[PDB]
Amino acid sequence: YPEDEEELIRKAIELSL
Amino acid sequence: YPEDEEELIRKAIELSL
Amino acid sequence: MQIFVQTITVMRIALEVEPSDTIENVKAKIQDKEGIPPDQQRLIFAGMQLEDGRTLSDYNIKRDSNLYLVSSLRSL
Amino acid sequence: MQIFVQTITVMRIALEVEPSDTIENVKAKIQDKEGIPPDQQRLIFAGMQLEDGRTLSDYNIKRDSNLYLVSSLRSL
Lengths: 17, 17, 76, 76
What we know:
The complex is a heterotetramer, with two copies of chain A (17 residues) and two copies of chain C (76 residues).
Chain A: H1 2-15
Chain C: E1 2-16, H1 23-34, E2 41-45, E3 48-49, E4 66-72
Antiparallel strand pairs in C: 2-3, 2-4
């Protein structure tokens, strides 16, 4: 599910800071 | 996992628009 | 050394519904199919969290509508 | 009437590691414990996606470090 995955990755990158 | 859940909800609300 | 991994998992399901189904009903179908307890389920559509006692028609959820669901599990 | 639900599921795991473990290694431990294929795994820490051939020490991942993981599954 590529477009949701990229969004969630971008969100998880944010959460990791 | 309340703080991650609220973030993901907020992200899923965004994705739903 | 113990580390912790916050796993976020994405899976898309399809559901066979009537416009007259309540949100509560839908969460029960998702439990029946996927094992997610309905009280750990937060169903989302068109920018809102959906309330259990409303129907899919209440939210103009039409066929091939795309909802989101955010849940917490202890184990998969 | 068929609707689609994009389910996002959150579960926190703990992992027993050495600083010398590679990222690839960690993804294998997560597969062994949770059944997520490692090629569907995107491990995230301190604002980066982590590369398979690096070690946890390469990223200063210390004990009680909190990583994220984003995966896609077909079924739970």
